[PDB]
Write a protein that binds this ligand. Structure first.
Ligand code: MG
Ligand code: ZN
Ligand code: ZN
Lengths: 69, 151, 284, 47, 33, 307, 345, 84, 48, 436, 225
């Protein structure tokens, strides 16, 4: 229900956005979504909508998740 | 053959380029110089013929405004960076490919250029024809066309 | 052994392939009610609405002349069947029947009433392949039938109730029902029997076939930036047998995640190459 | 024309003679197989 | 053929992230000896 | 807005043609110049959409087993008769299915009028032919009449609940067949509406227009605003303890109501009345949603409450 | 696996990112998703038991299928996948029948007519692959061809014809010379019949050329014009001045490029969606029916052909046969073929 | 995981190390009872058992142990995947 | 299931004189090959 | 399909070895091979058929009829001219003005040898027999030919022999006239063999008298039994309906009952409806067609199909299979409409995924998981030793049953299965014998 | 007989999703019969754009040629602009007869609809649409002749103007059909038309008046007692 125009404007890579939204959805699966309401939306769409009004430099947690074994 | 071409680097630092000219048959032009040079980063700063004015910087993205500005004032061929003149590491950099064709913005890092180029070359096939599909197949293979006088 | 002769009575449904007498074809679109169709004069309404843009593209014009001749003969049949409805075996009706037909038509027997029952649905017209009716012949036929000489008739709009501000062409065209049905063409599979040596889903609509992901289709995903859709669509869906059930268990449980170690086709290829003198050993 | 055209008259256009009529369309296979299997008397079957 | 992530787009970004994570792990292990 | 415009006069000129209530037309000269295409089209689109009629929906004869069989006396197959019985207009003016009998034999033309039915189904088209028998055996055909609207497939009402040997068939409930439409400006410009409705003997032409107008008015009216089950379970369905089951069997109890009604009087008056078990049983009863009393004394004491 | 095949049909009511999907195919492709929904919703117990609920096709399973198929994109591709545009994801929507609905504008990208062609459907299982196809492979994002910067959502046959019929202006028409302030007045006049569809009319329209607010200067254009121009977004360098052309297929294709170049992608897709309905509504109202009188032969051809036949007779009597046969056919018939062509034109 | 796939000539020692047993009789299966042969192409003793956790001759078909080897039969109990 | 047999069309078992139209040769010329292709037997050729 | 001339097989050029010259059309195919009926697939130009008047000589060459014409006055003795022999002759096209004794134009269009050039009336020896000589039987049915493109007409020929026979079809209003000949010539309609009158038409069998001039000591009467609904070779219904009434003396060599997709002898392929070429809200944007509900309300385009499923009862090493009436662990509701022998009764409605024939095969002992064993011990049920292998209907419309046929071995025949079937068969045989 | 009550009928036709102002509005008729959603919408659209009581202007000011003058004294725009602005003016005449109206002002300020003295007791609902910011000019003392009338009317002493005003209270309508069903039948259409009246009458009241007019004009059936 939301275009990828603002998402590409926030992050011009167009490839890191997919991984960022996937990590945001995996985090919103349990105890999250305190920034934007659901509004009858699923996890990926709500994550993409929240990315338009959220910090884009949140890949630190994604990098630290696979930092060690 | 082009499955290994992937944009890996952003900038290469290469100053070389290839001259680009418009096609002309007699007194009419087939393709405008603005449409041919559009979408590629300028190699060197182009100078306005006659008037000593720099219309385009040394290395800048040729947008539609710069495109029709160069098309308005008459100008000869301009040196433009290309993927053939790049001297980067394994792969291709985003500073020589230029503007993407699917989207208006420049090409992103990691996009496959060889596969899309092969698909675009094979798309207009099946409607061709001394030239045509066998001629293109022979030219791409670079075989012996016929007995011709050596230079 | 036992044989069951099950029979099905299929009807015309959306998605069926219906082609005309000429090269024109096309899948049948959504069927509309009788009132939504264009309301022709005298209460009649059309039954099919074809696109007229196929004439300039495909150089075929016989369908238009066929439609005009069909409209003419249908009008002739409608005008002749109404003449007999007044009084059967009328002297004036036989005169019109003999005038419209080019004479072995009149018969002394009582079978003239049976001929009118068949002619009421339109008088048949037999035109040779190379000696067909010329323009003047069809023009005179349309003029005698009572339809305007131009061939087109004014048609109203049933959906809105307004008349189009242009003449439209209407007539009777011969339509066929091709064998390419939609019920036998549709097919969907989720989990079916796998191959024997390759351990992949079988092909063909016979026993739960799977749509083959062709080599050209893999290039489309490689053109896009998609790397995870093509990675799981080739290993965890058909190739991997160990991790094939893991994704199904994760889906049925509610967690979206998958793990692919190595496809079975690569293992089969490695076992094949090892059979020859070549030594294909993995490292690291 | 006998019991077929009487029930339904079909007008024909064009001006072409109808002297010769086309043979049966299935005569090819039948004539080819008849030459193989004679099915005749003993003195016959010569080909 | 092997059934791994293609080194293009998403695969390239994931490989770059894995490389930077390995570099960070090596830097963390250098100080710990 | 309300009786202000030049409303058409009542009693429209009904052209009583020579068709016996099968082909008539209506006219209206001052009827709202400008509304000739609105009112007429609105009345025509509804006249062919919804109109309660009647038609056969189940064929069953003795000499057939399926829709692709063949009789011994008829001239055509069984499925051919299905394409002719469906085109038989009849009205029932009453709710509920019926059963029309068809038993006859003779020269072969079996007219639709020769169908012995009760005095509730007036068959139409007495000259219609169903089958043709060559002076052979008789035929026994029983029909079924209903009332729908528009169209109904053959796999929606026929195979719902029917034994083996019932020829399924679809029916079309539409009393009208074709409707015309015209508008002519009269002499003060006003349009003259002329529509010649066509219909069979099920409903008269003048009545179909009235029904369509009433349906349209009823449709347009929407816009204008004002201008405990736990007692059914047996007593031994919880398995509290062995002694509890023993005393419940000795007491001859089948329902929990008789046990919940007696709080302490009938409890202690039983042999081996468990002091610690009487509290656990009351706790497990309260946990199920029931308590002492809180209902009529032995309300569902009959077998009507059994599930 | 997790795929299906069926014939395709055209649907004008569907959006650009929505495609019709039969209930039979959707019920089989999304079986594990339906099982997970029944497990989480609480309407079922054991997994084996759930497998039994969908087998008998209970009426309650339809509500779970509509809830699960809300934003899950499915991949659709034709058989001869020549370019990368052949594979485009859509949002499935439940519909009756057995034919996969499609959009009239998206059919041009697949390069497949609706005569007998059939398309396959795939379902991404992983969450990352599902979310990756929404922002990377959606049909709304693939609006420009990868070979060159040319829009691929141009109207093919009917929308372009309707727009051309609306763009034509004729000097002789009723109700010419009146001034209309708003398009509502023009529509009310057209309903009464006082004004024709296209005729010289001066109306009020806003352009916003200085990137601010405009005083709505009056413009003289037909009612057909400025009706489709209202769908154009508010932005400089575009406006009613661009609709003055005849709205040719090349012109309408160039129009979609400038609107996408200047404004964003959402405006382009919304304008393409709005213009599609208007073209179909206008084409179905006019008499585009092709008849026998539509095609006419030039009256001068009957004399040109006889003159050419008379001229070619003298060349045969003169004759070298090769040279005569070569010069008589490339000069008499070649010039005569072009003469009748320009005559009929 | 695995990386840097290398292919080269295979020596006889490597081929002997890869193989488990040497085939000597070209007997696929028996005509009366369809079972593997002693030295045929389809051998259970060389290519593992046919059934999952069930050795031949009905001696260790309990499927509880997987490291035992049937003495009289001569094949160990292993999954059918080991036959590939 | 009834199965019909379609007729076959092949070259007539006679002598032919076919010459290539200046193809498969170093310079422009004709070969003028002749064939004695029989019905059932070894084929013969007399190519130049 | 019988007038087809293939180029592949044992001794023909392979599809990959065809090339470009074999697929091309030669100017000698005029009147011998119709260059309009050819598959538009990969093997194009290799499955061409013959013409309507083309024949085959005793040697194997293709023959074409040519009406011999003398100097001016055309003769009336048509002679078949071979392909190789017609090279040394002159051919004159048809449609020549024959109002007088000879052609008065003196410039009739004719082809001397291959290429057509305007020739004189002198030494014209051969004339075209008919214009419908270079077109095949399939393309001859196309009405108003010669007005469409050559390539588009090729597609119309392939769609001609692809239409399923509809129930209650009619002849086309605009027909080329060749439909009657192709209908009466093909083996799809019955034809009377004598002149005798008909006695009675019982629908499934028509009886005819001996003759009006029958021979002495000949057969009594000619009985013709019309085939009822039976599965064809392409899974489509095939039935014949009578057309004669009481009396109605018929001449020998006349069609009596029409075949599939035929009415009154004239050939038919489908019903025809009113058409209006116009765009309707974009529903017919691409190459599609829009139809109304009136075409489905009357049931004019409905057809019939037959699947004819089968099942075997082969024995096994671990015991013999059996057609058991009740399969283990099956629901009682699913056993409805099933005879005691295990076969569904004739005329029983069946749905997709139904048990048509209940067959159980002996299954060997197999190990089970401990949890399943614990559940079985908890519920007390005993695991069956047979496996469920009954036939089930694939996904589809699930039509009604028509007929069922069972075959038994020579050891046991009608012992305890299908005894009522054999009884009904022998009763019907005796009934028809007594009637005859 | 009871045939007009068996079919499904929407019992809650009060879905007014449009709440932007008192002019816009959007009704919903989702639970409707298949086919009625189009015919009812078309009838309502053709009736709302038809003869309905309203009020026009059909008057101009003095010292100006008909469609020929351009400016009297520092006028903002051409006379056609002022004519178009005055034509789109809401008004509801309670009494009958072609009453008169006058407008006069001064000073370099924007002209207002209210400043128009209504002697015939015909107030202006929206007195802010007219935009006249003339400075240092006596472009005042205009005369208006409001006249009652139903439906659109074509363009029909010295100083008059042939301007045709919209007597209908509504300005534009557009219906639509969208079937919304789950398991019973995917054929029940839906009517989601909207109204964009000027403000003289609310869209709900306009729809009610149209329905009442249709019910009154559909009296061509038997009384049936
Ligand atoms: Mg196609
Ligand atoms: Zn570079
Ligand atoms: Zn053992």
């Amino acid at each position: 229900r939301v275009t990828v125009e603002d998402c590409v404007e926030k992050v011009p890579n167009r490839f890191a956005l997919v991984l960022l939204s996937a990590h945001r959805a995996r985090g919103i699966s349990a105890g999250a979504a305190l920034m934007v309401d659901r509004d009858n939306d699923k996890n990926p769409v709500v994550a993409l909508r929240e990315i338009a009004d959220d910090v884009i430099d949140h890949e630190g947690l994604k990098e630290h998740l696979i930092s060690t074994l | 053959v082009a499955q290994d071409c992937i944009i890996v680097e952003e900038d290469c630092g290469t100053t070389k380029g290839i001259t680009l000219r418009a096609v002309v048959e007699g007194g009419d032009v087939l393709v405008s110089l603005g449409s041919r040079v559009l979408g590629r980063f300028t190699a060197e700063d182009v100078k306005d013929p006659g008037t000593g004015e720099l219309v385009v910087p040394a290395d800048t993205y040729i947008d539609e405004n710069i495109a029709d500005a160069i098309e308005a004032a008459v100008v000869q061929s301009v040196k433009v960076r290309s993927v053939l003149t790049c001297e980067a590491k394994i792969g291709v950099c985003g500073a020589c490919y230029g503007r993407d064709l699917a989207r208006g913005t420049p090409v992103n890092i990691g996009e496959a250029v060889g596969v899309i180029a092969a698909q675009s070359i094979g798309e207009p096939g099946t409607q061709l024809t001394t030239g045509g599909l066998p001629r293109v197949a022979e030219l791409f293979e670079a075989r012996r066309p016929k007995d011709c006088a050596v230079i | 052994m036992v044989k069951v002769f099950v029979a099905v009575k299929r009807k015309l449904q959306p998605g069926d392939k219906m082609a005309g007498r000429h090269g024109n074809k096309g899948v049948i679109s959504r069927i509309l009610p009788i009132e939504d169709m264009p309301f022709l004069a005298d209460g009649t309404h059309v039954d099919v609405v074809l696109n007229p843009l196929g004439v300039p593209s495909r150089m075929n014009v016989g369908q238009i002349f066929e439609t005009h001749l069909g409209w003419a003969c249908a009008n002739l049949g409608k005008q002749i069947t109404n003449l007999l409805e007044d009084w059967q075996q009328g002297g004036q009706k036989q005169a019109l029947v003999e005038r419209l037909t080019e004479e072995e038509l009149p018969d002394t027997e009582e079978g003239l009433v049976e001929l009118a029952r068949n002619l009421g649905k339109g008088v048949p017209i037999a035109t040779p392949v190379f000696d067909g009716a010329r323009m003047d012949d069809i023009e005179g036929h349309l003029e005698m039938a009572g339809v305007n000489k131009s061939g087109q008739s004014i048609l109203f709009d049933g959906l809105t109730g307004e008349q189009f501000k242009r003449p439209v062409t209407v007539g009777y065209i011969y339509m066929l029902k091709l064998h390419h049905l939609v019920d036998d063409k549709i097919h969907a599979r989720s989990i079916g029997p796998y191959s024997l040596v390759t351990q992949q889903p079988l092909g063909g609509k016979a026993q739960f076939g799977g749509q083959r992901f062709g080599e050209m289709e893999v290039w489309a995903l490689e053109a896009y930036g998609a790397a995870y859709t093509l990675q799981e669509m080739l290993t965890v869906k058909s190739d991997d047998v160990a991790g094939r059930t893991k994704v199904y268990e994760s889906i049925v449980r509610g967690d979206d995640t998958f793990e692919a170690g190595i496809p079975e086709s690569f293992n089969v290829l490695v076992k094949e190459m090892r059979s020859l003198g070549l030594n294909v050993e993995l490292e690291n | 024309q006998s019991f077929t055209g009487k029930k339904r008259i079909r007008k024909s256009f064009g001006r072409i003679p109808e002297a010769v009529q086309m043979p049966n369309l299935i005569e090819v296979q039948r004539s080819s197989y008849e030459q193989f299997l004679q099915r005749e008397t003993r003195p016959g079957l010569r080909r | 053929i092997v059934g791994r992530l293609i080194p293009a787009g998403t695969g390239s970004y994931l490989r770059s992230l894995q490389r930077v994570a390995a570099k960070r792990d090596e830097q963390l292990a250098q100080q710990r000896e | 807005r309300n009786w202000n415009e030049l409303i058409r006069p009542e009693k429209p000129q009904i052209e009583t043609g020579a068709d016996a209530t099968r082909k008539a037309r209506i006219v209206a000269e001052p009827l709202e110049r400008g509304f000739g295409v609105t009112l007429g089209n609105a009345l025509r689109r509804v006249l062919l959409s919804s109109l309660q009629g009647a038609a056969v929906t189940a064929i069953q004869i003795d000499g057939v087993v399926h829709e692709f069989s063949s009789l011994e006396g008829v001239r055509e197959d069984v499925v051919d008769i299905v394409l002719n019985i469906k085109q038989l207009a009849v009205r029932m003016h009453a709710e509920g299915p019926k059963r029309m009998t068809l038993r006859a034999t003779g020269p072969g033309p079996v007219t639709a009028g020769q169908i012995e039915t009760p005095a509730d189904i007036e068959i139409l088209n007495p000259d219609h032919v169903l089958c043709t028998l060559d002076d052979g055996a008789s035929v026994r055909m029983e029909f079924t009449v209903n009332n729908g609207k528009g169209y109904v497939p053959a796999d929606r009402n026929r195979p719902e609940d029917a034994p083996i040997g019932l020829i399924a068939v679809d029916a079309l409930y539409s009393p009208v067949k074709r409707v015309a439409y015209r508008v002519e400006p009269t002499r003060l410009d006003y349009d003259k509406l002329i529509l010649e409705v066509e219909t069979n003997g099920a409903v008269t032409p003048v009545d179909a227009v009235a029904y369509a107008a009433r349906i349209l008015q009823d449709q347009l009216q929407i816009f204008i605003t004002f201008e405990n089950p736990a007692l059914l379970k047996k007593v031994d369905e919880l398995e509290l303890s062995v002694r509890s089951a023993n005393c419940l069997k000795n007491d001859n109890i089948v329902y929990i109501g008789d046990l919940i009604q007696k709080t302490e009087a009938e409890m202690l008056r039983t042999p081996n009345f468990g002091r610690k078990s009487l509290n656990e049983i009351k706790e497990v009863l309260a946990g199920m949603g029931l308590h002492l009393g809180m209902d009529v004394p032995n309300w569902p004491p009959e077998n009507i409450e059994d599930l | 696996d997790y795929s299906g095949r069926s014939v395709i049909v055209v649907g004008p009511e569907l959006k650009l990112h929505e495609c019709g999907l039969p209930k039979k195919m959707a019920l089989e492709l999304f079986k594990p998703f339906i099982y997970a929904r029944l497990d989480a919703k609480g309407l079922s117990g054991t997994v084996k038991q759930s497998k039994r609920m969908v087998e008998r096709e209970q009426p309650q399973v339809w509500d779970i299928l509509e809830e699960v198929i809300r934003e899950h994109p499915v991949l659709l591709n034709r058989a001869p996948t020549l370019h990368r545009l052949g594979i485009q994801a859509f949002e499935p929507k439940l519909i009756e029948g057995k034919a996969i609905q499609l959009h009239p504008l998206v059919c041009a990208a697949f390069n497949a007519d609706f005569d007998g062609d059939q398309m396959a459907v795939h379902v991404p299982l992983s969450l990352e692959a599902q979310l990756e196809a929404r922002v990377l492979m959606m049909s709304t994002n693939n609006i420009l061809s990868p070979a060159n910067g040319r829009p691929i959502i141009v109207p093919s046959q009917d929308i372009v014809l309707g727009l051309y019929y609306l763009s034509v202006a004729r000097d002789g028409e009723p109700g010419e010379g009146k001034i209309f302030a708003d398009l509502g007045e023009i529509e009310a006049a057209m309903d009464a019949g006082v004004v024709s569809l296209h005729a010289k009319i001066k109306a009020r329209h806003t352009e916003m050329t200085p990137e601010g607010v405009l005083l709505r200067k009056v413009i003289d254009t037909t009612p057909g014009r400025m009706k489709i121009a209202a769908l154009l977004p508010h932005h400089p360098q575009i406006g009613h001045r661009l609709i003055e052309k005849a709205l040719t297929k090349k012109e309408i294709g160039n129009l979609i490029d400038i609107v996408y170049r200047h404004c964003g992608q959402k405006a382009t897709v919304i304008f393409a969606d709005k213009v599609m309905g208007l073209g179909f509504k206008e084409a179905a109202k006019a008499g585009i029916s092709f008849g026998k009188d539509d095609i006419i032969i030039p009256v001068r051809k009957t004399a040109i052909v006889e003159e050419t036949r008379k001229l070619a007779e003298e060349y045969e009597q003169q004759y070298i046969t090769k040279g005569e046969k070569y010069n008589k056919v490339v000069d008499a018939w070649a010039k005569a073929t072009d003469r009748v062509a320009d005559e009929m034109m | 995981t695995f990386d840097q796939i290398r292919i080269s000539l295979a020596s006889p020692e490597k081929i002997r190390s890869w193989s488990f047993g040497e085939i000597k009789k070209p007997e696929t299966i028996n005509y009366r009872t369809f079972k593997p042969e002693r030295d045929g192409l389809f051998c259970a003793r060389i290519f593992g058992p046919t059934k999952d956790y069930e050795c031949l001759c009905g001696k260790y078909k309990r499927m509880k142990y997987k490291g035992i080897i049937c003495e009289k039969c001569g094949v160990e109990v292993t999954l059918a995947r080991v036959r590939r | 299931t009834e199965r019909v047999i379609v007729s076959q069309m092949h070259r007539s078992p006679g002598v032919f004189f076919d010459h290539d139209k200046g193809k498969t040769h170093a310079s422009g010329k004709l070969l003028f090959a002749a064939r004695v292709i029989p019905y059932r037997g070894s084929w013969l050729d007399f190519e130049f | 399909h019988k007038r087809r001339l293939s180029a592949l097989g044992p001794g023909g050029l392979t599809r990959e070895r065809a090339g470009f010259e074999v697929r091309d059309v030669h100017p000698t195919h005029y009147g011998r091979i119709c260059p309009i009926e050819t598959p538009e697939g990969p093997n194009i130009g290799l499955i061409n058929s013959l013409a309507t008047h083309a024949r085959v000589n005793k040697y194997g060459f293709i023959e074409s009829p040519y009406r011999r014409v003398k100097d001016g006055k055309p003769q009336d003795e048509v002679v078949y001219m071979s392909a190789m022999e017609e090279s040394k002759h002159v051919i004159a096209q048809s449609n020549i003005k024959v109002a007088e004794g000879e052609i008065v134009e003196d410039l009739v269009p004719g082809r001397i040898n291959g290429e057509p050039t305007l020739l004189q009336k002198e030494t014209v020896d051969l004339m075209d027999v008919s214009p419908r000589q270079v077109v095949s039987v399939a393309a001859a049915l196309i009405p108003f030919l010669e007005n469409d493109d050559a390539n588009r007409a090729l597609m119309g020929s392939n769609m001609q022999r692809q239409a399923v026979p509809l129930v209650q079809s009619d002849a086309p209003l605009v027909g080329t006239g060749m439909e009657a000949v192709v209908a009466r010539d093909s083996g799809a309609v019955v034809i009377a063999k004598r002149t005798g009158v008909v006695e009675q038409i019982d629908g499934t069998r028509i009886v005819i008298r001996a003759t009006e001039e029958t021979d002495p000591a000949r057969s009594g009467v000619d009985i013709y039994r019309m085939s009822k609904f039976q599965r064809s070779n392409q899974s489509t219904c095939i039935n014949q309906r009578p057309l004669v009434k009481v009396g109605d003396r018929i001449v020998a060599g006349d069609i009596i009952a029409d075949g599939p997709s035929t009415e009154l002898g004239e050939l038919a392929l489908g019903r025809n409806a009113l058409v209006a070429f116009m765009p309707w809200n974009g529903y017919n944007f691409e190459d599609s067609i829009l139809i109304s509900e009136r075409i489905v309300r009357d049931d004019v385009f409905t057809s019939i199909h037959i699947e004819e499923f089968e099942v075997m009862a082969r024995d096994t090493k671990l015991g013999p299979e059996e057609i058991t009436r009740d399969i283990p662990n099956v629901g009682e509701e699913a056993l409805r409409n099933l005879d005691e022998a295990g076969i569904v009764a004739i005329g029983a409605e069946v749905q997709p995924g139904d048990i048509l024939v209940g067959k159980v095969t002996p299954k060997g002992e197999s190990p089970m998981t401990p949890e399943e064993k614990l559940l079985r011990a908890i519920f007390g049920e005993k695991a069956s030793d047979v496996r469920d292998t009954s036939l089930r209907l694939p996904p589809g419309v699930a039509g009604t049953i028509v007929d069922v046929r069972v075959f038994n071995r020579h050891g046991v025949d009608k012992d305890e299965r299908a005894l009522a079937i054999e009884r009904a068969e022998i009763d019907r045989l005796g009934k028809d014998r007594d009637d005859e």
